[PDB]
Amino acid sequence: SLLVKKYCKMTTEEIIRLCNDFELPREVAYKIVDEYNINASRLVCPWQLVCGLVLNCTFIVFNERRRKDPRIDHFIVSKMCSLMLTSKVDDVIECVKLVKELIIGEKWFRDLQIRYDDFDGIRYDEIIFRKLGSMLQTTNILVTDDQYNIWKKRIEMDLA
């Protein structure tokens, strides 16, 4: 596999490829590159670090499509499971949570979280009432109005 391999080497454009495979922007890629070339010093395997990095770029920027399509989270993890050639995956789970333990508190990471607004994948104006101590907290088991406004058309033409 890619993470049993000890002391591998990478470049700017090697990981530009592994990040541009998701058609992500180049700014995020340059940030991971800066992360690397400063902190690629004390390593065991950079495939883990850059794996976790670009995964926590995807989960933060792609929350919209995933918020409406839970069919995504299987396709995405399957993609990066075989891009790095493994049938086992819990190591990838660790690849995400460990970088998240590491990269947790930098001002640029902060800037991205205010930009694309995950905060564990949930909005601010909701979670603060989720957690301060409230019942007005909107757990959307119920559905929104426009949903039904458009679901009605499916049975409008039920005659056919």
Binding site: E101, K131, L132, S134, L136
Partner: protein, 247 residues
């Protein structure tokens, strides 16, 4: 530096041995030391201009639970407040402008009164507090057949009080407030035993501010059963400037 940061492995990591010639024997006197007056001045300048607008907004967000607060108070659940930042300018505006007028009108008269209890005082004793209890509630004294051999007065009084109010109108008559419950002269087991054998009362019950990480060991299970804080979390990141008066 090391591998693990926030776990027991992070603890084993950061707690091992150093060299003694690796000791930067350096001091804060290798830097300016200047009067505390302008120190507090500029502290308060940032506390009055640096994070003011957002603090106001989040304060306004933190409000709509007053109904929830009162409603849980109504069944007699004495209350908690934890979280970070000073926790005084929340509660002192909570009680006065919400509780006593509202419950005054609902009880149907005079507003329900309160005292306050600065725990953080180093001179915080309990016997003066029981004096003011007897001043305001004005309960009944004890016989000589029950103060058993120098048995402490306030406690047996209060065992007499808890039974006198056992079947009175299920109403309200007062509230007491605490601040820095884990303060120096207040975190002693006497004072805590007092305010834990206290709040079985339906006529009163308490709002509680707290700050310490290891506060929550300070109480027992019998106490918590008797005392039933409802653990709400309220963190504010506030400068706590005026508590910078004792230490």
């Amino acid at each position: 530096a090391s591998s693990f940061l926030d776990t027991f492995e992070g603890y084993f990591d950061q707690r091992k041995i150093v060299r003694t010639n690796a000791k930067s024997r350096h001091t804060m006197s290798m830097a300016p030391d200047v009067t505390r007056e302008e120190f507090s001045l500029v502290s308060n300048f940032f506390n009055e201009n640096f994070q003011k607008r957002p603090r106001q907004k989040l304060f306004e967000i933190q409000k709509k639970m007053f109904p929830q607060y009162w409603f849980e108070l109504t069944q007699g659940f004495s209350l908690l407040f934890y979280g970070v930042g000073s926790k005084r300018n929340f509660l002192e505006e909570f009680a006065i402008d919400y509780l006593s007028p509202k419950i005054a009108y609902s009880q149907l008269v005079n507003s329900i009164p309160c005292l306050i209890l600065n725990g953080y005082n180093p001179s915080c004793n309990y016997r003066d507090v029981f004096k003011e209890i007897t001043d305001l509630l004005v309960p009944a004294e004890l016989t000589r057949s029950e103060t058993k051999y120098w048995g402490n007065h306030v406690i047996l009084q209060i065992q007499k009080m808890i039974d006198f109010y056992k079947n009175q109108p299920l109403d309200i008559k007062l509230i007491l407030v605490v601040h820095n419950l884990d303060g120096p002269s207040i975190r002693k087991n006497t004072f805590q035993t007092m305010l834990s054998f206290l709040s079985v009362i339906r006529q009163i019950a308490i709002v509680a501010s707290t700050d310490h990480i290891y506060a929550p060991l300070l109480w027992d299970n019998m106490k918590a059963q008797n005392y039933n804080f409802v653990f709400h979390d309220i963190s504010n990141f506030e400068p706590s400037t005026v508590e910078s008066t004792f230490q």
